[PDB]
Swiss-Prot record:
Subunit structure: Interacts with (symmetrically methylated) Siwi. Interacts with (symmetrically methylated) Ago3. Interacts with PNLDC1/trimmer; interaction takes place on the mitochondrial surface and recruits PNLDC1/trimmer to Siwi-bound pre-piRNAs.
Subcellular location: Mitochondrion outer membrane
Protein name: Tudor and KH domain-containing protein homolog
Span covered, complete protein: 245 to 462 of 629
Gene name as annotated: PAPI
Function: Participates in the primary piRNA biogenesis pathway and is required during spermatogenesis to repress transposable elements and prevent their mobilization, which is essential for the germline integrity. The piRNA metabolic process mediates the repression of transposable elements during meiosis by forming complexes composed of piRNAs and Piwi proteins (Siwi or Ago3) and govern the methylation and subsequent repression of transposons.
Record family assignment: Belongs to the Tdrkh family.
Organism, as annotated: Bombyx mori
Residue intervals of the Tudor domain: 54-119
Length: 204
């Protein structure tokens, strides 16, 4: 184990599966990349210059975000058909810098220019250590309030546990960190999972 670190909670599915960003220069780099990419791919000519002739699962592409209409780097996790629109397949896309996942029409996808792969993927998957469900939807919502997900609230993270993740045969297993989150101020810290426990949402 090492010293605690500064993180942003960027995306949340459950306390057992959420995504964090490391607080530092790569955040600003990320803002730059978002601005730039949006600028570029907002022009039709550029979309045509990088139109996808073929799309595969796991392939990294440029993709719009339905909520804010901006362009992001995203990995295609799955593809499923529209029963009522043969001209439109949809892809379950994973936004690599934030962590959230959305269904996006394949038509809306564009090839991701190579130089845009330069910056490390910012979203790190984590779960909350020391707590199990008693998940309930309002527990998840509460967690999103506490963490202030995607609202750029800096929080302190300490790794406590982990869970291995399979790879190829004989390849080094990955490790998904079980961390604790804190909102530190002068009055003290706020242990998110301990709040979840106290409010009866989670169990020690």
């Amino acid at each position: 184990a090492g010293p605690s670190i500064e993180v942003y909670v960027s995306a949340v599915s459950s306390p057992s599966r959420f995504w964090v960003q490391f607080v530092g220069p790569q955040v600003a780099q990320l803002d730059d990349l978002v601005a730039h990419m949006t600028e570029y791919y907002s022009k039709k000519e550029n979309r045509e210059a990088h139109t996808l002739r073929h799309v595969s699962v796991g392939q990294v592409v440029a993709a719009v975000f339905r909520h804010d209409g901006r362009w992001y780097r995203a990995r295609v996790h799955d593809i499923r058909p529209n029963e009522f629109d043969s001209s439109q397949q949809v892809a379950d896309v994973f936004y690599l810098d934030y962590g959230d996942s959305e269904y996006v029409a394949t038509h809306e996808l564009c090839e991701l220019r190579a130089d845009l792969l330069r910056l490390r993927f910012q979203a790190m998957e984590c779960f909350l250590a020391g707590v199990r469900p008693a998940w309930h939807p309002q527990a998840v919502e509460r967690f999103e309030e506490l963490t202030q997900v995607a609202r750029w609230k800096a929080l302190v993270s300490r790794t406590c546990t982990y869970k291995k993740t399979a790879t190829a045969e004989g390849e080094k297993d990955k490790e998904i960190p079980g961390i604790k989150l804190f909102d530190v101020t002068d009055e003290g810290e706020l242990d998110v999972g301990a709040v979840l426990v106290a409010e009866g949402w989670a169990v020690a």
